[PDB]
């Protein structure tokens, strides 16, 4: 059990970071490569334990996989169709294997994900999406088992609710169905756009991505090809917040402002000087007062739930109260009790956190529990007085490529410690 040991400072975090490819685009694209009959190259793939878990599932199902800068997949030989209980419990994104397997091979099993602390996370929309495409699905011994006789069939699918995951499941599966799929009330996240762009690079016909209505005209087989994953907008946001809450200046390279306009506008609302270029974003906080903002999480292009913990920290440190309402995962406030151990002030009322003022943080032992809660704990440790120990940081390594190297380059004192 790795830990982060952090020596806090009042010196601003400043300098440059180079942004990695989006975890949340890399993962679905890797599962979508289960559709592909010829070799695939996915470039700009972050080095994350979820990418490792994905590669290990891909290999288990029969694809030949290897990596470094790119990930290389030869899925021609896929010859197994189960995502085991052990693998799904380590990462629920493995649910994405169900769609391509059933659409390509007419059969697939994926363990049904268990409980998650951040809120109810059912997969009813994924199942119902596949049923509308012609799948027969049953639950048996904790397994979602899907079958179709022959090919899936294009259907008009109106999603009950906006879901990123379920959008990816029906979109990817629709690429191999006979005829046309119209997916209505689709999620508009950039990683949906990136996956659809990847499906097109491999021979699919997906249009409307980035809109509330995606059109997929199915083909018999997908080929292979090349695709460079979009930059991680949430890693981008995270470093920009690091700069803002510490009063520093940072340039995030290999990223793009169009992926996080909501976060950028709020960082300006919070008093930061945000500038952008062709593939960079900079924030300057030097000589500027941090003011609290109100935030309401919602689907893209609104402010992202994946930035909410990071902005709870910002508001906590900023002058003023700041109200954060979570409409996506109504219980994603596990970082708050940990931050309160460091002397942060906030009240939690239902799905609303009201962030107070504090004079400053004070290092303590705190525990990572989910990806973004962790990142906010690491950042707080960098700005607290004294030594913070963040335990169970394997959570962070699921979602960030060597965050401690990138923070070190911005002037942080952070050590990865083993046991
Ligand atoms: C691996 C990955 O890409 N994960 C991201 C993805 O997760 P994920 O794809 O699970 O998130 P969804 O957009 O599907 O979920 C949004 C809401 O819809 C609900 N829901 C979802 C599916 C379903 O079948 N039924 C249902 O009720 C969920 O409980 C949640 O409250 O989008 C989230 C919202 O931006 C991000 O926080 C995650 O980092
Ligand atoms: C729900 C279970 C959370 O996302 P995880 O960090 O446990 O995967």
Write up what this structure looks like:
It is a single chain. This protein is α/β, with parallel strands linked by helices and 419 residues long. The chain folds into 2 domains: 1-19 and 231-419, Enolpyruvate transferase domain (UDP-n-acetylglucosamine1-carboxyvinyl-transferase, Chain, Alpha-beta prism); 22-229, Enolpyruvate transferase domain (UDP-n-acetylglucosamine1-carboxyvinyl-transferase, Chain, Alpha-beta prism), CATH 3.65.10. It is built from 14 helices and 24 strands. Helix 4 (98-105) packs parallel to helix 6. It is elongated, with a radius of gyration of 21 Å. The structure holds uridine-diphosphate-N-acetylglucosamine and [(1R)-1-hydroxypropyl]phosphonic acid. It is an enzyme of class 2 (transferase). One of its GO terms (biological process) is peptidoglycan biosynthetic process.
Give structural attributes.
monomer, 419 residues, alpha/beta, UDP-n-acetylglucosamine1-carboxyvinyl-transferase, Chain, 2 domains, four-stranded mixed sheet, 14 helices, 24 strands, binds [(1R)-1-hydroxypropyl]phosphonic acid, MurA_subfamily, Enolpyruvate_Tfrase_dom, cell division, transferase, cell wall biogenesis/degradation
């Amino acid at each position: 059990m790795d830990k982060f040991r952090i020596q806090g400072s009042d010196k601003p975090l400043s300098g440059e970071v180079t942004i990695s490819g989006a975890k949340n685009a890399a993962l679905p694209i890797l599962f979508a490569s289960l559709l592909a009959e010829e070799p695939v190259e996915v470039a700009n793939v972050p080095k994350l334990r979820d990418v490792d878990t994905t590669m290990e599932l891909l290999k288990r199902l029969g694809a030949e996989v290897s990596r470094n800068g790119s990930v290389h997949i030869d899925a021609s030989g896929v010859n197994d169709f189960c995502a085991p209980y052990d693998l799904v419990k380590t990462m629920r994104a493995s649910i994405w294997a169900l769609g391509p397997l059933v659409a390509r091979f007419g059969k697939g099993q994926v363990s049904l994900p268990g409980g998650c602390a951040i809120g109810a996370r059912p997969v009813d929309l994924h199942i119902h999406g596949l049923e509308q495409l012609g799948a027969t699905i049953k639950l048996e011994e904790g397994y979602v088992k899907a079958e179709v006789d022959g090919r899936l069939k294009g259907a008009h699918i109106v999603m009950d609710k906006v879901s990123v995951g379920a959008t990816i499941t029906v979109m990817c599966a629709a690429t191999l169905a006979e005829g046309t799929t119209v997916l209505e009330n689709a999620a508009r996240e950039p990683e949906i756009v990136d996956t659809a762009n990847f499906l097109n690079a491999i021979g699919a016909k997906v249009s409307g991505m980035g809109t509330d209505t995606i059109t997929i005209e199915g083909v018999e087989r997908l080929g292979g090809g090349y695709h460079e994953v979009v930059a991680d907008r949430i890693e981008t946001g995270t470093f920009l917040v690091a700069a803002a809450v510490s009063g520093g200046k940072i340039v995030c390279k290999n990223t793009k402002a169009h992926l996080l306009e909501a976060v950028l506008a709020k960082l300006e609302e919070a008093g930061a000087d945000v500038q952008t270029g062709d593939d960079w974003i900079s924030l300057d906080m030097t000589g500027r007062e941090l003011k609290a903002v109100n935030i309401r999480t919602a689907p893209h292009p609104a402010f992202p739930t994946d930035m909410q913990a990071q902005f709870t920290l910002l508001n906590m440190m900023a002058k003023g109260s700041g109200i954060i309402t979570e409409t996506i995962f109504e219980n994603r406030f596990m970082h708050i009790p940990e931050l309160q151990r460091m002397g942060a002030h906030a009240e939690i009322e239902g799905n609303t956190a009201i962030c107070g003022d504090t004079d400053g943080l004070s290092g303590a032992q705190v525990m990572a529990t989910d990806l973004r809660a962790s990142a906010s704990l690491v950042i707080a440790g960098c700005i607290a007085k004294g030594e913070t120990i963040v335990d169970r940081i394997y959570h962070i390594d699921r979602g960030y490529d060597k965050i401690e190297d990138k923070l070190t380059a911005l002037g942080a004192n952070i050590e990865r410690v083993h046991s």
